[PDB]
């Protein structure tokens, strides 16, 4: 797939709001992912022991990681589809080191869309949500094509 430039604008216009608080959004997103789909927390060897949302909220390691995730994703969105170099090292670690199935990337995509919708209703109407979803689907499709070259297609 290919997004039009107006779709990328909608995506980078909300993203600019997210970047006002990268650590807070990181936290929200990862917590929404873990509560919705608890099985995903098992993949994290540092975080696994967390039992409640109160524990998640107070974890400095969860917050540090959320910043790591959003910073990497942001650098990929800002590429506007020309992200092949940024996707290589990411596809290699998630496919052969962490072992993250495509299904899980769909779950965090859902958590990103949930949080933006709650925090940014004015900049995340139906068109901008459709453009964010298209941008994350492009991301998943290109990662999945890389997982298969790497021998994982998980
Ligand atoms: C929007 C998609 C995602 C982005 C952009 C992302 C990004 C990253 C980055 C930049 C790192 C550190 C460098 C590396 O290991 O490659 C990382 C590590 C990791 N990622 Fe992801 N990730 C995403 C989705 C996921 C999901 C959905 C899971 C599990 C459900 C997962 C589990 C992990 C684990 C287990 C590590 C290692 C954490 C640690 O022990 O420090 N990732 N991720």
Swiss-Prot record:
Signal peptide from the UniProt entry: none
Subcellular location: Cytoplasm, Sarcoplasm
Globin domain mapped to chain residues: 2-148
GO CC annotations, alphabetized: extracellular exosome; sarcoplasm
Record-listed nitrite binding positions: 65
Gene Ontology MF: a single term: oxygen binding
One Pfam assignment: Globin
Enzyme Commission numbers on file: 1.7.-.-, 1.11.1.-
Residue numbers carrying Phosphothreonine: 68
Keywords: Cytoplasm, Heme, Iron, Metal-binding, Muscle protein, Oxidoreductase, Oxygen transport, Phosphoprotein, Transport
UniProt catalytic activity: Fe(III)-heme b-[protein] + nitric oxide + H2O = Fe(II)-heme b-[protein] + nitrite + 2 H(+); H2O2 + AH2 = A + 2 H2O
UniProt cross-references to PROSITE patterns, sorted A to Z: GLOBIN
Residues given in the record as O2 binding sites: 65
Entry-linked InterPro entries: Globin, Globin-like_sf, Myoglobin
Chain positions found as Phosphoserine: 4
Function description: Monomeric heme protein which primary function is to store oxygen and facilitate its diffusion within muscle tissues. Reversibly binds oxygen through a pentacoordinated heme iron and enables its timely and efficient release as needed during periods of heightened demand. Depending on the oxidative conditions of tissues and cells, and in addition to its ability to bind oxygen, it also has a nitrite reductase activity whereby it regulates the production of bioactive nitric oxide.
Quaternary data: Monomeric.
Protein name: Myoglobin
Organism phylogeny: Eukaryota, Metazoa, Chordata, Craniata, Vertebrata
């Amino acid at each position: 797939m290919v997004l039009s430039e107006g779709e990328w604008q909608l995506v980078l216009h909300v993203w600019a709001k997210v970047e006002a608080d990268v650590a807070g959004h990181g936290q929200d997103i990862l917590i929404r992912l873990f509560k919705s789909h608890p099985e995903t927390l098992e993949k994290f060897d540092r975080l696994k022991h967390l039992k409640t949302e109160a524990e998640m909220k107070a974890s400095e390691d969860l917050k540090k990681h959320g910043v790591t995730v959003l910073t990497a994703l942001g650098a990929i969105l800002k590429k506007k589809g020309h992200h092949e170099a940024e996707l290589k090292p990411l596809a290699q670690s998630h496919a052969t080191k962490h072992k993250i199935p495509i299904k899980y990337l769909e779950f965090i995509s859902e958590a990103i869309i949930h949080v933006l919708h709650s925090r940014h209703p004015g900049n995340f109407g139906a068109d901008a949500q459709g453009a964010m979803n298209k941008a994350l689907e492009l991301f998943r499709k290109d990662i999945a094509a890389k997982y298969k070259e790497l021998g994982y297609q998980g």
